[PDB]
């Protein structure tokens, strides 16, 4: 699906341009970026479907765009330089390609079904680490600050920390957090209550890099489940969904 | 102390390229960096003292060097690109200059007392956030994990999130975390069990940047205390401090 993949690449970094020059300044950009991507993909393929924030995440069987104009909202506002656009694409209720741009570091993350995953030219591949005790695991807080998700939050980290994890990292971006996964920079990821536009693109990439992406339970991924376990190995992934 | 400062700067940079180098492969470097700096400065200023990993943080009034060849050790071995070199300087029992160089993303942070703070030649200024509820806070698990130092991490964390804090960030580099604080991309920092060589250099940069660096307890910094609270505003430092 080249013309579309190319539309994704071309837009992800034009958006990525808009956000870099925006970060220099001292919600508008979001919409700007949103309405940029979605209006052009729209009347580029007027009959395609979309799934971005602006129930649920119900993926049909038709060619669907799954978009997050700005991932790293909060980071943006504090100008924490961990900000991203993520454009995923599905066909036949399968994830086709993904394109995730690190606006700051200028790293185009791409992933096509069966054709591998690359960051800036060269190929990516996960780690294969299977021993959780030797692993660097990623996760994120969340927008919602209810005492039930926050207790949750603290519950899973203890489990992961009592699971004897090498180190934990939370960077304010699930999209980039997972791209770290895909490239080997980390060995596992988890999170509850996260929308699927933050998931779609990263998954094809993580998969194409040789990794695994499942439901938190250890079962298969469920886009509407709003959760994830992404790992370097299905072993690692299993250890993580077990703990918690 | 112009002579000295450019000594660390050139070593932070020398060490850095070596780090970036060695990172390129697929901890002997840490020794290479340790020597790389302590050696030179040793010959250069043989009358000086060294505070480094090898009582520990007993600072006199003599001209003393506080060094961490590599901050972000676990990150190194994982290839997680959050690794830093730390060379701090004190004279007459006060912090004089600090130099921190994000090896990978190639940033040389510096700060000299009276002479403000910088990164790559641009003047740094703390954020100026006093509203803890609007704060991006950074911390670190730390070294040990013995249950003692691991349920504290979760008590602190739980407390912080409990205070309706914007977000939490752990990136696996104390000095880099603390540099973000200087830059303005974060609002505060807190940690229990971090050594002075991680903290000497950063405290200088945060101070010269307009930030406040204090003891965990709200009191002033006690370098032999292996703990810190740093923040954009004394206002913030308190709201954090009175959460702990």
Curated annotation (Swiss-Prot), chains A, B:
Instruction: Tell me the InterPro entries matching this sequence.
Output: IMPase, Inositol_monoP_metal-BS, Inositol_monoPase_Li-sen, Inositol_monophosphatase-like, Inositol_monophosphatase_CS
Quick one: which residues bind Mg(2+) 1?
A: 53, 68, 70
In the Enzyme Commission scheme, what number(s) does this protein have?
3.1.3.25
Which pathway is it part of?
Polyol metabolism; myo-inositol biosynthesis; myo-inositol from D-glucose 6-phosphate: step 2/2
Tell whether 4Fe-4S is among the UniProt keywords: no
Q: Which UniProt keywords apply?
A: Cytoplasm, Hydrolase, Magnesium, Metal-binding
What molecular function does GO assign, one term?
inositol monophosphate 1-phosphatase activity
Activity response to pH changes: Optimum pH is 7.5-8.0.
Question: What CDD domains does this protein map onto?
Answer: IMPase
Highest taxon of source? Eukaryota
Q: Where does substrate bind?
A: 53, 70-73, 172-174, 191, 198
Induction section of the entry = Repressed by Li(+).
Which EC class does it fall in?
hydrolase
Q: Which reaction does it catalyse?
A: a myo-inositol phosphate + H2O = myo-inositol + phosphate; 1D-myo-inositol 1-phosphate + H2O = myo-inositol + phosphate; 1D-myo-inositol 2-phosphate + H2O = myo-inositol + phosphate; 1D-myo-inositol 3-phosphate + H2O = myo-inositol + phosphate
Residues binding Mg(2+) 2, per UniProt: 68, 71, 198
Its GO biological process annotations read:
inositol biosynthetic process; inositol metabolic process; phosphate-containing compound metabolic process; phosphatidylinositol phosphate biosynthetic process; response to lithium ion; signal transduction
Q: Does the entry feature the keyword Protein biosynthesis, yes or no?
A: no
GO cellular component terms, semicolon-separated: cytoplasm; cytosol
What cofactors does the UniProt entry give for this protein?
Mg(2+)
- UniProt activity-regulation remark: Inhibited by high Li(+) and restricted Mg(2+) concentrations.
Q: What role is this protein assigned?
A: Phosphatase that can use myo-inositol monophosphates, myo-inositol 1,4-diphosphate, scyllo-inositol-1,4-diphosphate, glucose-1-phosphate, beta-glycerophosphate and 2'-AMP as substrates in vitro. It is likely that IMPA2 has an as yet unidentified in vivo substrate(s). Has been implicated as the pharmacological target for lithium (Li(+)) action in brain.
Alphabetized PANTHER family for the sequence: INOSITOL MONOPHOSPHATASE (PTHR20854), INOSITOL MONOPHOSPHATASE 2 (PTHR20854:SF29)
**What does the sequence similarity comment in the record state about its family?**
Belongs to the inositol monophosphatase superfamily.
Q: How does it assemble?
A: Homodimer.
Protein name per Swiss-Prot or TrEMBL:
Inositol monophosphatase 2
């Amino acid at each position: 699906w080249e013309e579309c993949f190319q539309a994704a690449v071309q837009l992800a970094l034009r958006a990525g341009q808009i956000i870099r020059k925006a970060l220099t300044e001292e919600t508008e950009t979001d919409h700007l970026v949103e309405d940029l991507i979605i209006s052009e993909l729209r009347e580029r393929f007027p009959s395609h479907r979309f799934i971005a924030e602006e129930a649920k995440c119900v993926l049909t069987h038709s060619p669907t765009w799954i978009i997050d104009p700005i991932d790293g909202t909060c980071n943006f506002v504090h100008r924490f330089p961990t900000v991203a656009v993520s454009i995923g694409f599905a066909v036949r209720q399968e994830l086709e390609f993904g394109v995730i741009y690190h606006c700051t570091e200028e790293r185009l993350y791409t992933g096509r079904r069966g054709r591998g995953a690359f960051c800036n030219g060269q190929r990516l591949r996960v780690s294969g680490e299977t021993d959780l005790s030797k692993a660097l695991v990623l996760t994120e807080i969340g927008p919602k600050r209810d005492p039930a998700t926050l207790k949750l939050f603290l519950s899973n980290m203890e489990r992961l920390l009592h699971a004897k994890a090498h180190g934990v990292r939370v960077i304010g971006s699930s999209t980039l957090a997972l791209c770290h996964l895909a490239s080997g920079a980390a060995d596992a990821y988890y999170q509850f209550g996260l929308h699927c536009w933050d998931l779609a693109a990263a998954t094809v990439i993580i998969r194409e890099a040789g990794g695994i992406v499942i439901d938190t339970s250890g079962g298969p991924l469920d886009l509407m489940a709003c959760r994830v376990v992404a790992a370097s190995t299905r072993e690692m992934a299993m250890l993580i969904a077990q703990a918690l």
